[PDB]
């Protein structure tokens, strides 16, 4: 039981880190699709509306702080988060 408890603690820390990164990804996805809805305000665009309402990317308090406007630096941040 002692050995297994130790390995469990290690996995706990790993989980904390993964949880953080996933929160980051969800916030980024929501923000870029909001920008795409603003684009919808300028077929395919109603489809991306369907996307953003489909995903249910549960937002967190850290959302509004991460406001970058590039849409390409956004994509590289999203790719790194995904990796």
């Amino acid at each position: 039981i002692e050995e297994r408890l130790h390995t469990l603690e290690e996995e706990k820390e790993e989980l904390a880190q993964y949880q953080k990164w996933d929160k980051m990804r969800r916030a980024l996805e929501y923000t870029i699709y909001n920008q795409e809805l603003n684009e919808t305000r300028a077929k395919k665009k109603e489809e991306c509306m369907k996307k953003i309402r489909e995903l249910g990317s549960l937002p967190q308090e850290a959302f509004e702080k991460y406001q970058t406007l590039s849409l390409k630096q956004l994509f590289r941040k999203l790719e790194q988060c995904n990796t």
Partner: protein, 101 residues
């Protein structure tokens, strides 16, 4: 029966009515066995009976501790990583004890 040693009496004589609720925390070993040794007018016979009683109690405690520990360890190994005549006696002579006269 009656007394702060009735549990050990039962465990040494009958042992069946003794429930899983009794055995666990009813008796504090280091106190009760200590009580047995200087108790007034204790016969050697009854003392031997009480000895077998207390040893049976202790053995049962060991059994329960092992069972609960084993349960816990089996739990901890779990995780969630989402990624016709067949046999008749020959005639009746087997069971047909005849009537007397």
């Amino acid at each position: 029966k009656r007394g702060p040693l009735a549990k050990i009496w039962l465990a040494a004589h009958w042992d069946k009515k003794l429930t899983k609720a009794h055995v666990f925390e009813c008796n504090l070993e280091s106190s009760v066995e200590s009580i047995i040794s200087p108790k007034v007018k204790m016969a050697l016979r009854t003392s031997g009976h009480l000895l077998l009683g207390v040893v049976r109690i202790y053995h049962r405690k060991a059994k329960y501790l092992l069972a609960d520990c084993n349960e816990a360890f089996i739990k901890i190994k779990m995780a969630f990583r989402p990624g016709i005549l067949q046999e008749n006696d020959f005639g009746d002579f087997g069971m047909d004890d005849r009537e007397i006269m």
